[PDB]
Design a protein around this ligand. Sequence first.
Ligand code: A1BLZ
Ligand code: A1BLZ
Ligand code: A1BLZ
Ligand code: A1BLZ
Ligand code: A1BLZ
Ligand code: A1BLZ
Ligand code: A1BLZ
Ligand code: A1BLZ
Ligand code: A1BLZ
Lengths: 178, 177, 178, 181, 183, 177, 178, 183, 180
Amino acid sequence: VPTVIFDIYSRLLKERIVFLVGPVTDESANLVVAQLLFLESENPDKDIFFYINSPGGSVTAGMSIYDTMNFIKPDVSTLCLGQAASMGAFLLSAGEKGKRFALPNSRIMIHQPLIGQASDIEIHARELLKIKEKLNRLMAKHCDRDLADLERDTDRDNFMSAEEAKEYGLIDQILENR
Amino acid sequence: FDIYSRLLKERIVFLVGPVTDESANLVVAQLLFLESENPDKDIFFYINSPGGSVTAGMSIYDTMNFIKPDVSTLCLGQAASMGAFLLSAGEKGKRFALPNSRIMIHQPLISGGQASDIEIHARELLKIKEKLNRLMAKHCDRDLADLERDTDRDNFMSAEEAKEYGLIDQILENRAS
Amino acid sequence: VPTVIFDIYSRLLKERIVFLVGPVTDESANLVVAQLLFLESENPDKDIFFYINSPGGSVTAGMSIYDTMNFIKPDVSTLCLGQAASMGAFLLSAGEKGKRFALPNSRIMIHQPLIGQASDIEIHARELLKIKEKLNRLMAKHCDRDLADLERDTDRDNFMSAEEAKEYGLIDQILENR
Amino acid sequence: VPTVFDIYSRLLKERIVFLVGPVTDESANLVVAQLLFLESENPDKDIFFYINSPGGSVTAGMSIYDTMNFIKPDVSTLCLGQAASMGAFLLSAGEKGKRFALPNSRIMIHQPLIGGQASDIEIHARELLKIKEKLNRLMAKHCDRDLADLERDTDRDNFMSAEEAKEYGLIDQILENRASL
Amino acid sequence: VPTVFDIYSRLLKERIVFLVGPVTDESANLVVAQLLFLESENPDKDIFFYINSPGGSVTAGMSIYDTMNFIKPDVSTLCLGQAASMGAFLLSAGEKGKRFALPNSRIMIHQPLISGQASDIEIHARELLKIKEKLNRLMAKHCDRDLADLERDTDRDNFMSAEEAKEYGLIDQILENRASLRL
Amino acid sequence: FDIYSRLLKERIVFLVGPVTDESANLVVAQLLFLESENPDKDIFFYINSPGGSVTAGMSIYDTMNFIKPDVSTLCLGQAASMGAFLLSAGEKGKRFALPNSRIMIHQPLISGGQASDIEIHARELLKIKEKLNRLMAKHCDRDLADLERDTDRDNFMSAEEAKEYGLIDQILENRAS
Amino acid sequence: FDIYSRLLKERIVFLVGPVTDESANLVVAQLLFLESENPDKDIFFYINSPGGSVTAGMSIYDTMNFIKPDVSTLCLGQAASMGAFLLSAGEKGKRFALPNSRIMIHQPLISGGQASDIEIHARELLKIKEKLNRLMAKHCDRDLADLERDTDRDNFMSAEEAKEYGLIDQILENRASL
Amino acid sequence: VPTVFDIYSRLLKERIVFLVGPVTDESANLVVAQLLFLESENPDKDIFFYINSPGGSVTAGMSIYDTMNFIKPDVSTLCLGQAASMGAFLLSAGEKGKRFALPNSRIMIHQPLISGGGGQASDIEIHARELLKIKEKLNRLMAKHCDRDLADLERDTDRDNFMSAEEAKEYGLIDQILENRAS
Amino acid sequence: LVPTVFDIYSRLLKERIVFLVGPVTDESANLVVAQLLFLESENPDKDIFFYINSPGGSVTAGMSIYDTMNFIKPDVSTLCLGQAASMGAFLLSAGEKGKRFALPNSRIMIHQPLISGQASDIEIHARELLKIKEKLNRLMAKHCDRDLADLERDTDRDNFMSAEEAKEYGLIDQILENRA
Ligand SMILES: CC(C)(C(=O)NCCSc1ccccc1C(F)(F)F)S(=O)(=O)c1ccc(C(F)(F)F)cn1
Ligand SMILES: CC(C)(C(=O)NCCSc1ccccc1C(F)(F)F)S(=O)(=O)c1ccc(C(F)(F)F)cn1
Ligand SMILES: CC(C)(C(=O)NCCSc1ccccc1C(F)(F)F)S(=O)(=O)c1ccc(C(F)(F)F)cn1
Ligand SMILES: CC(C)(C(=O)NCCSc1ccccc1C(F)(F)F)S(=O)(=O)c1ccc(C(F)(F)F)cn1
Ligand SMILES: CC(C)(C(=O)NCCSc1ccccc1C(F)(F)F)S(=O)(=O)c1ccc(C(F)(F)F)cn1
Ligand SMILES: CC(C)(C(=O)NCCSc1ccccc1C(F)(F)F)S(=O)(=O)c1ccc(C(F)(F)F)cn1
Ligand SMILES: CC(C)(C(=O)NCCSc1ccccc1C(F)(F)F)S(=O)(=O)c1ccc(C(F)(F)F)cn1
Ligand SMILES: CC(C)(C(=O)NCCSc1ccccc1C(F)(F)F)S(=O)(=O)c1ccc(C(F)(F)F)cn1
Ligand SMILES: CC(C)(C(=O)NCCSc1ccccc1C(F)(F)F)S(=O)(=O)c1ccc(C(F)(F)F)cn1
């Protein structure tokens, strides 16, 4: 990691840029949370720019970012570069309405969740199903779409170009340059 | 002409160790062989097994009920899980255990995919659980509610306890029993 | 394997019983083919009783049994014990019409197929899709059902009791005893 | 971890302590150390204990729990992502009225879960059952519920939404943002 | 195995049955099968059950135990090399007065040993303690001893010489050769 | 204050080895850092890479085109697969290779599921293949048909050949070139 | 600037996890340092350990007794095996446990060679067993016969049971508990 | 295994029994079974027990030893290649006067040795005591086989003690070195 | 991985304390050698305190420490804490006579060398091992002020000694209980 007179990523936090790169785990998600809280403390009255290149990962770890995005005072602008798939698309669509962006050749993908005793099986299947539904409802709200749309369109892997994600309502604009 | 083929002449069939498709079908084949040789004489099905696959156990179960001979069952060592299910399925009046054998019964237990596929497989597993409880209640002359409660977790029984439960008919200490 | 004065399975071939047990592989399927051909040679004018307890397996290995069932002169009666899933259900439904049976607590399951360079990917996906369709059409013929029924009902794993498989048209009768 | 001091050390200066991931002897004592550090720096200010954890070792979690209660600062807890098993126990141990969950977090509670001679197995089985009852009694106290409630409700994995966790008594309030307070 | 209808098959004609090595479901049921065969061949003649075993599965050993007691032939037992654990149990289970050991064999007895949720741990610990108690009671019967003796004497591994096992009541005689037999 | 941070002062950014999400984002971060420091001066993007993830390469690609500075590219050692794609994406007129570097281009290459899922993923992969061919044709000033044919299998090019193909602009032997 | 170094300024030393040569010597080094900085101030030795090597534990034990400062001990989480030994070894009157910590004591446990060598090491282990029982009896103000009986198999104790036993002096719920 | 039935069964007809390789429960019991078969076939003719073994389990070797002493036939022993450890013990247990070695074979004797292994100090004390009982027992039995003082065997088995055929003859472990039948 | 107060072991090096912890290897032994030379350089007129908790390790690595202890001008006092076994006990016994110490519950263990091709090569390496065995028994007899035959007898198998037994044998000079 390059240094400059701190590391490259801490240098970019001075631009209020936070990256999510690769799979969403508790550890990688909480690193994003900590940067969000740090930037809000630095200045609660300036936007944050959350750049997302992720294939997805843990639902609960993603929810920790999601709820932090909505809790803190700064607007969280989101930007898809490379790809935002699964929980990465979810967080992308969670950016402040009107501040959700994708680079022109990035892609988006949305899908339903994917992963003892009979009694335990029943328990885990039921929570998975609730997650499924919760994700569909929150995504429909993000996209200003009907729940039944999301239920249909996440049944199997649904890849979208930046244009298709814009029409779907997952992002607001495709940015080619400043 | 091994020892087991020799006892096959006595119409004794063993199930030893885990219930798999392969070990179950070996039992099924012997049951059909014995029915072919003599459809009008009892078969003695000796079970010493920790359990194993439900569907493989069901292949033995339905063959037991399909063939003309009464399939007497005998627990030696243990009959646990699908082994107890098969023991309890012997012809009523002809289900036996040796005095220090033990029986264990419990609900289905499993060792991925989309939530849609998990849902389907959870529901099939619950149907299996209900079916086994219903069949076992029939075997033991008990209410379904008893079986549902009594198989929530591993339930070990002595030979006497399994008799009192309704899983077998008599404890045999020797022939004079 | 018990012997009797040959092994237990060769003894049951005298009853014209052939077993399929466990996964369908080239080797296990071809063993079934060889027994079918042997029994036809022994007497072309008597039924064969094909007992199936299988979770499925290779499509092409199953087709070797399927086409042999239809080629040889004896009617091939089929019987589900334990389970016939995937290619096992396919072969079960392929038995001579009116001679397809299931034991009372067996189960049936049907589903669509499941498994380099971009060019190669295209090639394998296309053959998989053809298999999908071929399986659906042959199953619809076996079941006296519309193709679109099979397409809907094999999209995900579709478990059926013996009664449900009978109503679906996969078997003819449920046998409890002789 | 971005560094100049890293991001977690910087937020520690705001009196935020994180529990992230499995509760081990090492992750738990790191939490204990931070709690003691913040008390020594100012024994009179609240500490904000943010938990995203699937659970882990009971005795390791107990070291955090007793430290939370030993130190003079109120320890406020926040559930973000999830607080499961010992994570949920620690969440419910925050200062009453200061236990929080974010709106889409989840909580899960359950009984304990893990050779020798039969004498040794008996001893360890007994010890595990004492732990089971101790944790159900402590949790009931946190939730202002009965021991019998917790025994029924932890027999298998019991997942709760933030609202369900609030109604149960595990947390005091769901915070969408600061205006929720 | 020399094929003289092999060597063990040949000795089965002398009504000798071996247990060699660990007691598993597979080795235990082979012993059971042979016991049933020899009873079928002649129900009024003794069987000689030669044991050289470190132990193994309790439930598998119980299948042999209950078979020994079920069939009509007396099952005489002989310790050669060792009979440890469930091996010792089966040795002590032979027909009283026909339990033997060679002079430098050894016997060992001990309580059960094992190599989920708390609810399931409780259920399985309780069952292991039931097994421990049952084995101690059955052993006290075989040895004509107080239950309390066996509880004390199986707490840890209890190695005994042939003479110690005879004085314990676990076997009846030590045989150096055929001329050794008494009574 | 390592050697690479020192060359970062010269506005040199390296991509060395496989293109992954992590190595690509490290490149992206440096491009954004350099634009922040000076949006009005060229960046020199030195590529020695066998390729790697398409989507990770796309994150670099779109950042190159998004930021204000011209991103000059230089192939040293090799630029293969997504490495050649990035090399070809440098600001036109400012794409370079050293004389003994080599370039390789090819169609997408992948290392399960239901036929429905295989179909979806095969089709996405074909869209990627078409997209890369279309973008590369734009970079090289060639017809799409040329790229489609020329990437069917691994296509190795010398520095001269890549220049003649349209992938780079000049071969630099030294500065006087 | 790390947190354990910071806490060392409060004269707090931690033993966390298994007692090894390396982790025990790190404790030794901190005890020597704190004595060097101020030989007339108490040291607070916080223990959360499942036990470990007896000889490594003895290096801590003898260091605790060698240095001039009183070494107060605190059980947090658990103090088992050599962890309990060191807990009980703190300056009498200054041995504490948190309310939900646990203590466990047991005889020595080893997880090859000629009979002569096995004889030698078996005898050394029995000397160790007797040394630990005798020293622990002294720490608890109890009989040698008590400890011999009470460590034959794993013996778990609540904080109240440990106090009753004499292994610690007081249970601290908070500072007002002293 | 050539089949002319197989070669070893054919040599069994000549009352030759092999122990080859390590002494395990399974390899020991096969020897016991052959010894009992040959006694059954003729209880008065010598058995020739050929030993090429590096040793193995004590209790397994004790099953053979006690069987050799139990049966009516004299068991002559012949060392070929090597008899080490429990192999050497069994070599020395052959009928006195009929213990032989081929001229370039070797013998090795040593005290008991445990491969590796575990547990509480009480348990380790129990098993170390049993191992020392076994060490003493083997030393006394070998002293008797060799017609030597116990103290000799204790000294001479402290570490691995390799002996040529002539050294083993001098020691009292064997009676004669056979280069051919004329010996 | 080590408290910083740089670090705690560097801080105790200011007190002229050097640790040997765990197995003696070329790397851990050269680190001890480096610290001894450093402390000699800083002040050749003060003792070094060499604290040993070690199960042993390489003979040649141990010899690099031993000859360095004897080469430098400072007295190297040794202290057994926890245990000093094998080469650890050798080095403990090698401290400046009168300045070799053990804490009351430490233990010492001494034994003969122990290791975990062509016959010619086997003969060569076996002869070298026996030279090492003989050299260590002679050097240890010298440190213990004992006859060589005593050491030959007492190292034939693992010989565990309490602190008192080690003092009586001659391996250490005094047992230290507290700082006063
Ligand atoms: C995040 C994913 C990986 C997920 O399920 N993570 C954790 C599940 S944890 C688990 C495991 C076993 C047993 C019980 C559980 C528990 F119940 F606890 F969860 S998801 O891939 O399936 C997913 C969700 C949403 C989207 C969308 F945004 F596109 F809409 C895309 N992907
Ligand atoms: C037999 C057991 C091992 C079992 O579940 N086998 C089949 C697993 S395959 C499977 C895997 C994933 C998804 C779906 C499936 C499937 F659809 F196939 F099931 S059981 O342990 O659960 C058991 C149940 C009942 C009893 C009683 F009889 F005592 F009452 C005893 N044992
Ligand atoms: C049989 C199954 C396992 C299958 O696909 N076997 C072999 C595929 S080979 C392959 C692999 C890689 C690349 C290309 C190929 C190829 F193209 F060559 F095939 S199936 O499970 O999917 C299935 C089919 C039908 C049914 C029904 F009957 F229920 F209807 C159930 N299951
Ligand atoms: C913490 C868990 C992992 C646990 O048991 N840890 C350590 C056990 S250590 C052990 C291992 C073997 C032998 C003996 C022992 C010993 F006895 F020493 F413990 S728990 O999952 O089971 C759990 C507890 C409570 C909750 C609640 F909060 F929701 F209520 C959730 N989970
Ligand atoms: C036989 C042994 C190996 C044994 O425990 N077998 C199976 C245990 S069952 C078990 C384990 C875990 C969970 C559930 C279960 C279950 F439910 F299955 F029980 S024993 O060696 O321990 C033994 C017994 C008796 C004697 C005596 F004679 F000497 F007295 C000596 N040894
Ligand atoms: C980059 C490579 C490694 C690639 O395919 N990465 C992404 C794989 S992930 C994946 C896996 C399964 C299902 C779907 C997907 C997904 F949807 F994600 F793609 S490439 O080798 O194929 C390549 C392509 C083009 C060129 C050119 F630039 F020269 F023209 C060079 N290299
Ligand atoms: C510390 C333990 C792990 C122990 O034995 N460590 C090292 C042994 S080293 C060894 C290994 C092999 C051969 C020889 C040896 C040697 F002889 F060298 F030791 S102990 O668990 O057994 C234990 C002791 C005391 C307590 C109490 F405090 F509760 F009382 C609890 N536990
Ligand atoms: C046979 C050998 C391998 C042996 O010890 N087997 C017994 C292992 S059982 C065991 C395992 C763990 C714990 C305790 C025990 C038990 F206590 F039960 F033993 S021996 O090599 O040591 C040997 C002995 C004698 C001779 C001589 F004849 F020359 F003199 C040569 N070799
Ligand atoms: C140091 C030990 C580990 C040792 O042998 N190290 C050197 C291995 S090098 C080697 C490897 C292969 C072939 C040849 C060789 C070579 F010949 F080179 F060595 S020692 O433990 O055995 C030991 C010695 C003495 C004492 C005493 F102090 F107590 F007296 C204690 N211990």
